[PDB]
Design a binder for this molecule. Structure first.
Ligand SMILES: Nc1nc2c(ncn2[C@@H]2O[C@H]3COP(=O)(O)O[C@H]4[C@@H](O)[C@H](n5cnc6c(=O)[nH]c(N)nc65)O[C@@H]4COP(=O)(O)O[C@H]3[C@H]2O)c(=O)[nH]1
Ligand SMILES: Nc1nc2c(ncn2[C@@H]2O[C@H]3COP(=O)(O)O[C@H]4[C@@H](O)[C@H](n5cnc6c(=O)[nH]c(N)nc65)O[C@H]4COP(=O)(O)O[C@H]3[C@H]2O)c(=O)[nH]1
Ligand SMILES: Nc1nc2c(ncn2[C@@H]2O[C@H]3COP(=O)(O)O[C@H]4[C@@H](O)[C@H](n5cnc6c(=O)[nH]c(N)nc65)O[C@H]4COP(=O)(O)O[C@H]3[C@H]2O)c(=O)[nH]1
Ligand SMILES: Nc1nc2c(ncn2[C@@H]2O[C@H]3COP(=O)(O)O[C@H]4[C@@H](O)[C@H](n5cnc6c(=O)[nH]c(N)nc65)O[C@H]4COP(=O)(O)O[C@H]3[C@H]2O)c(=O)[nH]1
Ligand SMILES: Nc1nc2c(ncn2[C@@H]2O[C@H](CO[P@@](=O)(S)OP(=O)(O)OP(=O)(O)O)[C@@H](O)[C@H]2O)c(=O)[nH]1
Ligand SMILES: Nc1nc2c(ncn2[C@@H]2O[C@H](CO[P@@](=O)(S)OP(=O)(O)OP(=O)(O)O)[C@@H](O)[C@H]2O)c(=O)[nH]1
Ligand code: BEF
Ligand code: BEF
Ligand SMILES: [Cl-]
Ligand SMILES: [Mg+2]
Ligand SMILES: [Mg+2]
Ligand SMILES: [Mg+2]
Ligand SMILES: [Mg+2]
Ligand SMILES: [Mg+2]
Lengths: 454, 459
């Protein structure tokens, strides 16, 4: 279910861990030092890396720093597993970018809980990386592939221990924008707003922090919001639960502020990376101008042009008209002959429309079975002629279908609309058009109806 | 971690299930009949529905059919939980679209394993649906998924048992294209190729079907490929394991051939649903028409439009004009500052052009450093006005460059052209615009030069 790379200078360690992980059905590979490790990671792109710190030559902190400094590997969670146990070295490991820092001998129940958690989180990151990478024979821009810090960031602190909360707030205060909130019900609201990270106390006295987290996770709006939970280091059952319901990361009471700072930064920086991906995906769709199926222009492109043309109309320029065409009984077509045949009809209809209208006109795909034609410098009466012409052309001739094998009769209903002067707006114009289609429908279909200015 | 709607006519049932699920930290809501259930599902979009079959009025098979027939709710997994246990009841439930069919009194360990599984899957799908609904709302993606299509479908049967393999193949054979493969190592390869679903034997004698599945799941190529596992029915632990390593669904042996058929169809249309989403999302930045770097329309598009406009002009309609713009000393920019900056200038120039010209005009990328603007219903004189305006917008103000650090001065030369008479053609029109450009540049650059058509004294 995951490819895990294990790194340690002692063979006994490597194969003991290996047997545990393959017993849980993971695909394990191994390296015996830093240099090797970095080569395998760059080549094989594993899902997780488990890493010794103390090794002859290049040590685990360095290895870790390099993995995060290459864009190919920056995204892979690293878990340090080591014999060291000083606070000093704990903090050095987290500051160098590791998700967790475990001290030998490790708790297997926590290791597997943690691994199952990381893989769950990597699911969405990886899909989005796949989505982007399918722009690669296209055009990227703007983005200079440049990272994205972990500083800044608005942090909500849900806690009913005033002493503890203020300490947490004082530490984050220098580098971040912290806000305290001891009411869980209010907190639910706040957490929807402008917030990058929530810190929740699982050992709160007046509410259950874990239930509160489950709450955030269940509602679609905040399922993605990172959550860092304060827990008791002696209560293993509760730590596993925390990971299982969906907590991104954990901290031991009493709160070490240097540990706190390191993990808050880690979490804010991963959440930003995944919002870079989401926005890049959405910016590239914005740039699309045609409808994939019919190759006519899409409605986004159309409404942009309609904005400009209607504004110019309102301030005294040329009038604009709109035709809104909707195919009759289109659902009956799909329900009888199948979706494929539905698409043959749509494609043919688009080519017929395009070629019975002037080049200066803007025909477009407006919805599933709806088409709009914008006609610059055209008034209501002419538009009605043009609509009539298209109606008679569509129904005057059957449609080829089932690639060649069969004909079909198709008819359309059309609503027609023209601009009405200074007060008019493109949404008003379109609304009059579909009031026309509605009456045309009601009149018995295969009909044109022009609704007038008010 | 998930919103679960629970439906059943007896309060005792609803209440007992609710306790169990909230003890595992789920958000539960409830209904006690069909009508209510369907209203709640459409208003609230829960992550999973657990459903009784036998209820006064509308029953569970109907409620289920309606949920899958409405696009708002079609994607929600429905699990039926019922006192009924005939194989006929089971097959109807699965045929009406359920992910699973459980008999009361349920196995809780198993219910949770199954819930935990559905939600792991929903994570990918709902990120996808979410992005794709963003695409629909901004006006780019349009259309609809097929409502039927779970038939056809290339199915790989990884199995050790000749005879069982053969029966599975015979049943699927009518509606799908099965292929048998008893070697797991070969099967790893085949599974990469053209395959929609793998059926694997968890109780195979010569290899571990679950290890084989873990294998598919770990390699990035086949991580989404649906897998249906045949399992011994007296091994709850192995069943849970199967669900944990990532199996889409379980089928108890000895194989019921109509159970098989129903569960294969369900998985294949779920696969195609997620494919349809991925295509909408990606394939929509493919098909030329615009120029990647600048956003403006490409050349092929522009010459198509110019043909139609010029023909209409020549037969008596509105006149048409062309501007041909070419950036001055553009080679100097690439050679002094590098192509990163050359591109920054082209992109910005496109922004300044697009926004100083009317919507009805067609600005476009014509060559490396050349742009053309087509102006419908416009004559030579007005075109010269437009060219001059544009020219001063580029030279009147320096260009940002080196992302923010550095300022560059850029100038353009423009040739101008307009339709004239019956005998004119688009290639003639553009050729006059080129002669303009050539004069503009000879005259000392940062200039506009228009070119009228002429005939000889005795033409
Ligand atoms: N296709 C196209 N044609 C263009 C463009 N610019 C000018 N024309 C054509 O050239 C004419 C005269 O432009 P003008 O001398 O700036 O005289 C202009 C200008 O003084 C003013 N005006 C009109 N629209 C605008 C505008 O959007 N912005 C500004 N700033 N002034 C405008 O009134 C005008 C006279 O209006 P029209 O009757 O339309 O007469 C316009 C129009 O037929 C253009 O970008 N695209
Ligand atoms: N944007 C746009 N506007 C349209 C369209 N169809 C008609 N109109 C507008 O309304 C017109 C009157 O159309 P008509 O009655 O067919 O009267 C037509 C028709 O009889 C003939 N005609 C012009 N172009 C064509 C053509 O391309 N094909 C055919 N078959 N006849 C044409 O002369 C016309 C009168 O010419 P106009 O002065 O242009 O007057 C035109 C035009 O202003 C259209 O598809 N798109
Ligand atoms: N009844 C009518 N139909 C219209 C009108 N405007 C456009 N159409 C329809 O759509 C046209 C294609 O328009 P085009 O792209 O401008 O391409 C147009 C245009 O470029 C030119 N053309 C044809 N007739 C005339 C005309 O009478 N006057 C002018 N100025 N151009 C014409 O060739 C055309 C292609 O020939 P068609 O087969 O007629 O194809 C015509 C016709 O089917 C109109 O006003 N009235
Ligand atoms: N009927 C009418 N509408 C007006 C007038 N002035 C402004 N508008 C409307 O608002 C414009 C945007 O204002 P702009 O800043 O002048 O932005 C203007 C201007 O910078 C330039 N432009 C377009 N036509 C002309 C023109 O005839 N003369 C001049 N000088 N500039 C023009 O590009 C424009 C953007 O073009 P549009 O997309 O058409 O967008 C146009 C148009 O929709 C006007 O006098 N008459
Ligand atoms: N093949 C195909 N079908 C589509 C597409 N986009 C939307 N549809 C279908 O178009 C159907 C429209 O059915 P309606 O009942 S709303 O429209 P009708 O044409 O049947 O109604 P009228 O007779 O015009 O009143 C919907 O169910 C969609 O599934 C599409 O892109 N390809
Ligand atoms: N950065 C960048 N440069 C390009 C591109 N497409 C074409 N070019 C280059 O633009 C350069 C222009 O050289 P010219 O001599 S043709 O153009 P000039 O502008 O220097 O000539 P004029 O002074 O106008 O006569 C050529 O070397 C082309 O390789 C491009 O997409 N990005
Ligand atoms: F050698 Be490791 F740091 F335990
Ligand atoms: F009432 Be249910 F079908 F058990
Ligand atoms: Cl001329
Ligand atoms: Mg060591
Ligand atoms: Mg319709
Ligand atoms: Mg009942
Ligand atoms: Mg040049
Ligand atoms: Mg050139």
């Amino acid at each position: 279910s995951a490819r895990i790379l294990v790194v340690d200078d002692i063979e006994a360690n490597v194969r003991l861990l290996e047997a545990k992980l393959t017993a849980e059905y993971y695909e394990v590979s191994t390296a015996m030092d830093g240099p090797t490790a970095l080569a395998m990671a760059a080549r094989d792109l594993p899902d997780i890396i488990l890493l010794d710190v103390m090794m002859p030559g290049m040590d685990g902190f360095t290895v870790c720093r390099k993995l995060k400094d290459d864009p190919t590997t920056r995204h892979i969670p690293v878990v340090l597993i080591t014999a060291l146990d000083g606070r000093g070295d704990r903090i050095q490991g987290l500051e160098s970018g590791a998700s967790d820092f475990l001290t030998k001998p490790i708790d297997d129940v926590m290791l597997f809980a943690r691994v199952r958690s990381l893989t769950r989180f990597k699911l969405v990151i990886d899909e989005l990386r796949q989505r982007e990478a399918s722009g690669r024979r296209m055009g990227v821009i703007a983005g200079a592939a440049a990272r994205l810090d972990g500083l800044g960031g608005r942090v909500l602190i849900v806690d009913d221990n005033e002493r503890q909360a203020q300490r947490v707030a004082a530490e984050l205060g220098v580098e971040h924008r912290p806000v305290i909130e001891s009411d869980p019900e209010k907190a639910k609201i706040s957490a929807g707003g402008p917030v990058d990270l929530v810190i929740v106390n699982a050992a709160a006295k007046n509410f259950d922090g874990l239930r509160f987290t489950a709450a955030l996770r269940s509602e679609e709006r905040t399922r993605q919001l990172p959550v860092l939970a304060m827990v008791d280091p002696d209560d293993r059952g509760r730590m596993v639960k925390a990971l299982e319901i969906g907590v991104n990361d954990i901290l031991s009471r009493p709160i070490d502020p240097q540990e706190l700072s390191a993990r808050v930064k880690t979490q804010i920086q991963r959440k930003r990376y995944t919002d870079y991906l989401r926005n890049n995906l959405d910016h590239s769709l914005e740039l699309a101008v045609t409808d994939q199926l019919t190759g006519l222009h899409n409605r986004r492109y159309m409404t942009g042009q309609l904005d400009s043309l209607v504004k110019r109309a309102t301030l005294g320029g040329d009038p604009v008209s709109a035709l809104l065409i909707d195919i009759d009984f289109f659902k009956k077509i799909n329900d009888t002959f199948g979706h494929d045949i539905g698409d043959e009809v749509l494609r043919e209809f688009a080519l017929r429309l395009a070629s019975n209208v002037r080049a200066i006109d803007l025909p477009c795909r407006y919805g599933g079975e709806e088409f709009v034609v914008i006609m610059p410098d055209t008034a209501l009466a002419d538009a009605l002629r043009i609509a009539e012409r298209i109606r008679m052309h569509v129904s005057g001739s059957p449609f080829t279908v089932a690639h060649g094998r069969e004909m079909l009769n198709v008819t359309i209903s059309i609503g027609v609309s023209a601009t009405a002067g200074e007060g008019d707006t493109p949404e008003a114009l379109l609304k009059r058009a579909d009031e026309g289609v509605y009456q045309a429908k009601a009149s018995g279909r295969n009909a044109v109806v022009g609704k007038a200015a008010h």
